[PDB]
Amino acid sequence: SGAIYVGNYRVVNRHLATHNDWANLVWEDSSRDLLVSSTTAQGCDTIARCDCQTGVYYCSSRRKHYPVSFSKPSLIFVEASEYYPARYQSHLMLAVGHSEPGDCGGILRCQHGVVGIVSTGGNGLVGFADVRDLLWLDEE
Ligand SMILES: C[C@]1(C(=O)N2CCC[C@H](C(N)=O)C2)CCCCO1
Numbered sequence: 682s683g684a685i686y687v688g689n690y691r692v693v694n695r696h697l698a699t700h701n702d703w704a705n706l707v708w709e710d711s712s713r714d715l716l717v718s719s720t721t722a723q724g725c726d727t728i729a730r731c732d733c734q735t736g737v738y739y740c741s742s743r744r745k746h747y748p749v750s751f752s753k754p755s756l757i758f759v760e761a762s763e764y765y766p767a768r769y770q771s772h773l774m775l776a777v778g779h780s781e782p783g784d785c786g787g788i789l790r791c792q793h794g795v796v797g798i799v800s801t802g803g804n805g806l807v808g809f810a811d812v813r814d815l816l817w818l819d820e821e
């Protein structure tokens with residue numbers, strides 16, 4: 682589990698969104714595994730606006746932050762899980778690292794701010810849903 686809290690937005694994995702998230706929906710995209718809902722309180726996270734390919738992510742199943750090198754956001758084939766059939770997920774970045782179902786939501790960050798959240802795992806790989814192209818998170 683985990684979310685990004687920027688401005689009056691909460692960014693979560695679409696497959697982990699709660700009823701309150703769907704009842705206060707701003708935007709969702711199944712192909713990216715992302716959903717954004719509105720919040721009453723302002724958040725403290727800042728979004729990175731860069732092309733970094735190195736950063737650090739939080740792994741809840743290890744209670745640890747790991748430094749990683751990650752690929753550029755791309756369209757990647759992801760195997761079937763309890764939440765999605767086997768399909769292509771867009772705006773996904775891959776790295777070598779540990780990721781279980783429960784690690785989704787952990788933040789990946791670079792020197793500029795939050796880059797994305799854990800969305801996929803297994804086989805010694807971790808995949809992150811990028812948010813750096815969502816410029817509207819910084820306004821309204
Ligand atoms: C099985 C695993 C996973 O990769 N997925 C399940 C949850 C949905 C994920 C997706 N397609 O965005 C895929 C391993 C890592 C954490 C989440 O569960």
Ligand SMILES: [Zn+2]
Binds near residue numbers: 730732792793
């Ligand atoms: Zn950066």
